[PDB]
């Protein structure tokens, strides 16, 4: 709960506060939440890579599954026409 900022970092906290945040507290709270969100998107990116490395047709379990899904989609487009 006690936080220690070197001077360029504290000068940056002030830049972003003056940009529309309510206080120093609210900005740090938002930077923490945004950092977490940013790391969550890196992890989601890494998970899709892994799944694809292991299964090149993800999210379908096989190329046959994809084909079926495509054919049913095409049937539905035909029908709207």
């Amino acid at each position: 709960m006690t936080v220690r900022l070197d001077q360029q970092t504290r000068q940056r906290l002030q830049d972003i506060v003056k940009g529309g945040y309510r206080s120093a507290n609210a900005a740090i709270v938002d930077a923490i939440n945004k950092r977490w969100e940013a790391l969550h998107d890196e992890q989601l990116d890494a998970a899709y890579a892994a799944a694809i490395h292991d299964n090149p047709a993800y999210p379908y379990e096989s190329e046959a599954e994809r084909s079926a899904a495509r054919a049913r989609r095409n049937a539905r487009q035909q029908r709207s026409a």
Binding site: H40, Q43, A47, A51, Y58, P59, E61, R72
Partner: peptide, 29 residues
């Protein structure tokens, strides 16, 4: 029944209808 660690998958629990996982990347009509 396939098992994967990705945020788009969710594991079932004890009073869920069956064993395994939901994959939300595979939406179908």
């Amino acid at each position: 029944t396939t098992r994967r660690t990705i945020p788009t998958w969710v594991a079932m629990g004890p009073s869920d209808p069956l064993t395994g996982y939901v994959n939300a990347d595979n939406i179908e009509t």
